[PDB]
Chain A
C-alpha cells in the first residue's frame, strides 16, 4: 500500500527526465556564451566541412528559415572515443602555437563602447 511514494517517484522520474534534456540540449549553450546569415554561408563557400557547420549553426539557433531537426548519443560517444585514440611534445607544440596566435576590427570595439 503505497501512499505519497508514487508522487515522490513521479517527481523523481520527472527530475530524471529534466536532467537528460538540459545536458543533451547543447554543449556550448549549457556551458557558457549571432545573427542569421545565409549570404555569409553563401559568401564563405564561394570547403564542404565549412558549409556543414554553417547549416548546423542555423538549425540550433531556431531572414532565417528553420528545417534541420533530425541528426544519437551513443553514436557521438563512439565518435569521440575513436578521435581521442587518433590524437610532453604534444603539450609544448600547443603552448607554442597558443603564443603565436596571442601575438574593420576597430569599428566593432567602438560600437561595443556605444552600447556601454
Chain B
C-alpha cells in the first residue's frame, strides 16, 4: 500500500540488481575539467 516507491523496490529485489551510483569522483583524469576541479 505505497506509491511508485513500491514498484521500483519490488523490481530491484526481484531482478536482484542495485541501481548504479555516481562512479565518477574517484577516478577522473589530468589534462569541463575546470568545473570538475572546482568541484573537488
* Chain B residues engaging chain A, CB cutoff 8 angstroms: 33-40
Contact = CB atoms under 8 A, between A and B. Distances in A.
A113 B35 CA distance: 10
Contacts, number: 22
Interface string A101-116: 0000111011111101
Interface string A23-58: 000000000000000000000000000000000000
Q: Interface residue tally of chain A, by bracket?
A: 10 to 19
A37 B36 CA distance: 30
Interface of A: 105-107, 109-114, 116
- When A and B form their complex, which 8 residue pairs have the shortest distance between CB atoms, in order from nearest? A106-B34, A110-B37, A113-B37, A109-B38, A110-B34, A113-B40, A113-B38, A109-B34
A105 B40 CA distance: 17
Nearest to B36: A110
Nearest to A106: B34
A56 to B, nearest CB: 33
